[PDB]
Design a protein around this ligand. Sequence first.
Ligand SMILES: Cc1cc(CCCOc2c(C)cc(-c3noc(C(F)(F)F)n3)cc2C)on1
Ligand SMILES: Cc1cc(CCCOc2c(C)cc(-c3noc(C(F)(F)F)n3)cc2C)on1
Ligand SMILES: [Zn+2]
Lengths: 29, 29, 29, 285, 285, 252, 252, 178, 178
Amino acid sequence: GAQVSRQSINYFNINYFKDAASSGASRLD
Amino acid sequence: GAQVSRQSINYFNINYFKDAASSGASRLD
Amino acid sequence: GAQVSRQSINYFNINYFKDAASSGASRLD
Amino acid sequence: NPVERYVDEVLNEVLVVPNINQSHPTTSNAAPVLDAAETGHTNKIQPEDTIETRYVQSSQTLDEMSVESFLGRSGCIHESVLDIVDNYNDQSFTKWNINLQEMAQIRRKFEMFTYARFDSEITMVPSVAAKDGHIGHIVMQYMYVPPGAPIPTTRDDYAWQSGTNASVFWQHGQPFPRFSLPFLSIASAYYMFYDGYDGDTYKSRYGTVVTNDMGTLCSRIVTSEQLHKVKVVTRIYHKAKHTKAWCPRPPRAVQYSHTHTTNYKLSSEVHNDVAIRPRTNLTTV
Amino acid sequence: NPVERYVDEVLNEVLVVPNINQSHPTTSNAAPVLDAAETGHTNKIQPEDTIETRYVQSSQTLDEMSVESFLGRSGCIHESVLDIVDNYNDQSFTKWNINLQEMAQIRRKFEMFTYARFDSEITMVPSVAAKDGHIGHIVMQYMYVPPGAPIPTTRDDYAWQSGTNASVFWQHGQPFPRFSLPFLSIASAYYMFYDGYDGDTYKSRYGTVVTNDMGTLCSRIVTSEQLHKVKVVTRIYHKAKHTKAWCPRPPRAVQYSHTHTTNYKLSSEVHNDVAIRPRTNLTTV
Amino acid sequence: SDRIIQITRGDSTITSQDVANAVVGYGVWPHYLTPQDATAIDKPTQPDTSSNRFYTLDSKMWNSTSKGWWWKLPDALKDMGIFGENMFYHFLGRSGYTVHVQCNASKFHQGTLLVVMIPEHQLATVNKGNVNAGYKYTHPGEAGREVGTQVENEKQPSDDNWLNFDGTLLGNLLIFPHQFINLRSNNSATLIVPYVNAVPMDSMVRHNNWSLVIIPVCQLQSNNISNIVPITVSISPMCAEFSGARAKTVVQ
Amino acid sequence: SDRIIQITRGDSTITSQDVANAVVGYGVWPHYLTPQDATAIDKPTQPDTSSNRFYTLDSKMWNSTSKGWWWKLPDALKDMGIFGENMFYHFLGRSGYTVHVQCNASKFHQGTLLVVMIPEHQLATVNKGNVNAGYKYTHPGEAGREVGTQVENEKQPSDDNWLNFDGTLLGNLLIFPHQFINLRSNNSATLIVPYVNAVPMDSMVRHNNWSLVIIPVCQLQSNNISNIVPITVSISPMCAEFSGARAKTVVQ
Amino acid sequence: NIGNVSMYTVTLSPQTKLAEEIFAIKVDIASHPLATTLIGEIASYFTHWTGSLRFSFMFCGTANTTLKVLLAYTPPGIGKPRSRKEAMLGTHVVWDVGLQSTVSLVVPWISASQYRFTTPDTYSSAGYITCWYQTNFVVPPNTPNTAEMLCFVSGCKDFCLRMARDTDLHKQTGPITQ
Amino acid sequence: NIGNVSMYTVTLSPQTKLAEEIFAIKVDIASHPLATTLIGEIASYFTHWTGSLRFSFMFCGTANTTLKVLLAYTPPGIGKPRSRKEAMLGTHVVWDVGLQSTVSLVVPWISASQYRFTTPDTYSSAGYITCWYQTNFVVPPNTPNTAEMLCFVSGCKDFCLRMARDTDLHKQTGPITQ
Ligand SMILES: Cc1cc(CCCOc2c(C)cc(-c3noc(C(F)(F)F)n3)cc2C)on1
Ligand SMILES: Cc1cc(CCCOc2c(C)cc(-c3noc(C(F)(F)F)n3)cc2C)on1
Ligand SMILES: [Zn+2]
């Protein structure tokens, strides 16, 4: 599952696995 | 085929094969 | 994330990595 | 929210544990700490009832203790050996009567329930040992022979055609083979235990061997005879998916002896046969 | 705009630095350049206060200086060796008491904080050296044995079944293995330092060894004995993800001696033990 | 006047007419444990004014050759009234502190003390392999430790002030909550630190959260050396709470 | 069931399956001192659950010749955890109590104990002129006093149970908060008493507010005398508060 | 006693000395006297545990046998209590035997860290449970002068296990054959 | 001095010659007298730096000791100043010792390029900081004839580091064992 945003420039922020530890580097701020 | 949900954060829950035995671990509760 | 355009002929211009240096050749003009 | 549902799965907070509430000193003829174990019920007393507790917001979750999680990890269930020593035709193929009784680790876990229903994920780890130097081009064939189907008796038996049986061909250098199997019983659940026989005479068989026939796994080196001999060991791993279990039971306390039976060995000094460690006396922690 | 947010991540302009504004000559009894270091606070004077500056539009960003970036790079933390010399059964497996104290480069970075909470990404780089010529078909098994689980004592120990522990099988020729681990402490953060003991006697242990037990990493060559001996060196790399750090501290100034301790060696000429370079005198740049 | 201060804790009040402001460690004021961060489920005991008061340790003499002094908390208060009793009758304890270091001389004296509060100050041993500092050496009590004096036993910790007794350079200690006592400017330092740990409460007996380190970075000088110049430390617990009551623990 | 009871105080819980109800001395439940009755102006310390818990004293053996036993409060608790520490570090103390006397036998045993809580039980001396009971005799601690045993020194108090050790008749002790432990009916007694004094707080060391007196009015009898029948007392302070902190008082 | 049902019972009887100790064990869910209980066996499949434990005791003497016992829990940071006085200063329940044969003592979760290791590791050693005579074991004439007591254990609403691992309470030293 | 706290102090005293030099160091954030400071250590984990630096100095003589000092920053393209006159032609602060014991000199970012290398590389060599007597160190009678001065460093609001790299201020020449 992933978070889709729109403005048009969509930001498909996918998370391929079912665990939080699996995702990549965090966002800053 | 897969179940798409929206809120925006879409949860594309894909099932790549045509058999139920093929999918991954079940949801709890 | 990628920029989706429509007219129907959609131009999914994907950027697979989180850095600008990662993308391919630039557009001209 | 099916999306709110998803956030909980990613964070593993689907099954939360209750909080501890603040309690106060009490004086009454309602004595929760007193009860009767004879009833067969566990006293439902909680910490707030015996001591004065503070308010604590619990964050723990029970997700990992779910049956799906407990039985949902791949464990070894068999180690197949094809050792070429002096006769390729006789040593390049073999068979195994399928079961989940040969490896103690996963067997003990499933046997903590009386019945269980689940789908299976089989993963195979083949490893080719070069006894003489080279390994050549190893191609393996693993074939599932359900009870009743013809079992191959030579490396070129017609049964290897696999016209209807399921076969998985693996080529050395490629990823480990894997596939799923749906719940296979002719009943509604698999029997982890079975207090029954396949007849009513002194010679009738007893136990799960009567109900758990899963067929045979036949395998062979597809590659024809090579100058250099190899020893191929294929380890089979199993994992349960979409699991349901009924009637929990006491865990196996002594080593296993044989498949499909609860039989056990006992030495002259039994404390060595169980995990219980002898205490010096009642008051020696 | 969560899309405006994304453009900033791609360009790495999430944390911008302030601009320098134009300043002018001044004459007042407000003296910003004067202060008192005794207070324990840093004088907050900026360049506009001491010289006449021009207006400059800063473009620099602090993204790369974030804690996530500083600790978010894979570094080596261990080099496992399986060297077949004369006994396959004894030399084809080994174990390692997990920790992030053996390699100076990443250890020093994490130790610039007192506490840190993060998830881990482990990447393994296995390399098989052919001591006699061929390498055959090498298949490796890396198993995580959490504290308490049975540790294998032979290459065929039942513990290798991995009925519940996590194991990663790697086949030579396939990509480097990799996996993630969630924050593992029983506390809210990992202790980079710990001024405590596991008891109150002269024989109690001191330091992080008391709080940082991570279990053991057991590995073995799955492939059975081959004619040609090999030496397999597996290098483990670690990277922190979703990081948080608290209470920064002075960087390690002398070489490390042992794991879980701040102990150090000192020679007769101490200037050789630190990175400080002797000055000829106060005025020799 | 910004150079005067009065600190009241319980039945105690401390004053100074030459301060250099005050420091609040990490900008966080001490506070009681909240139910969202708490883990131990029994109701804590909060002695309030009978424990959250100033306790004055033994004084030390500062001379031209002094190398420094250090104390560990809560160890330094193990024998201080009700606070001390509470840390031994309970398994768990939690507390913040107001550390007030006192040292006066004259307008004709010079010298500078660096006063630092270090969290998790894990000491080192020197040239002794993997042998670590022994329990009794890091639990000196109110007497603290006078750098450059002890009789070398094996489990004796490092006595190198320039390496922070832990393998890091003295000049960088300023990254921790600190103040300076520069005789020409002030005669006291005040640090208020909150509870800092990776767990909400901990053993007051096996774990020292903070370490008070006082190093004279500028030698004490004057033309009247016969006049002794002492250094006195007064510490006041803040929001002290304890949990897991039982018999009193007896150490060593 | 009206003959069962569970009493929870702090981290302690006591039960009995054969009680004779409970008694609340003078119908007043213990409570903290209010600002209208208070006199000492410093903020009191209230240990809460670390002091308001059951403390079990040494057990006593009841036999066919026993004449009785007595304890004084707060003296009996002078060495009981945090409560004990607090009464010596402070000048003033104030507290109520839950006294639970335990004694079980069998349905073939008989005997009766009169359990009484006496306020200001000023003991007497017999045939010794104006010489009064000495301090150490009225401060036995948790061991209490076993009537009919002591070695006659001059400041030794009266040991006449029928005269209440004070010149009044035993039969009238029922005018004070009390209960009976009649072996055929109950195996425990429970008395909850509030703070009683002419002043809001007092010295925990020089003044004993209550006295627990246990007198066997009906001799213990059975046909299995070899089986020892003990008497155990468990006391729990309630709303304990202390004031006027300082160094710890050392007695005698 | 191992290999006998008597390994599950504790004998009580008329005492000649007061406040005698009856039993003492570590409270750690996977420590040894209770490692083979069901909750102990399950805890042995996980690395971390948290929550409160419920200990129950059932008296098995005659209906005419009386007794009062003190069950105490001693939080960590101190040795096991050497006397009843020392033990009762911690968390405890005074149990009076009567019509209801069973009593329960709850060992509250009192720890520095949110979780503890299930395997015997000092740092996360949870304390002890001791049992002492509060009064005595009394019986009328012509009645057995000894009686047994059964001990149970289970987890409270806040009990929880974490990080699955293989158990060391069971092994395989050879092939399991047909 | 290395291995002593005295390596952190600069001694001042009554001079017999006017305008004497007190100290001189390169201003490069990772150059050597200041490489081991906290900002220097962190800069050593990056390849590029930019921004202004804040240098502070605290006088530690008696309250009756007076002094005026000139702190100067010399931009690149020239050698270090050989005299006070030559030094004061650049950026500088004249510090008068008094009730406030500390002064701060800001070394403005004056460079051709937006960034500089943190490692000692001539092209991006940032200049020098020198200290000279503006007047003299004066004291009344019966007062110490020498005094110490402490020097601090930190970065201003525009300070920034770029391109992470491994440091050369720490190494490992052998295995770190258990
Ligand atoms: C109870 C209970 C449940 C089960 C099922 C165990 C799974 O056994 C197997 C395995 C391991 C493999 C196959 C299999 N199907 O196809 C292939 C292959 F040909 F690819 F190997 N192997 C079929 C079964 C029923 O056994 N006992
Ligand atoms: C502080 C602090 C934090 C940590 C965690 C270090 C990561 O250590 C590991 C590693 C390197 C590997 C595994 C691991 N899990 O599974 C496997 C495998 F079996 F695939 F290898 N290895 C588990 C831990 C806790 O150590 N100290
Ligand atoms: Zn070859």
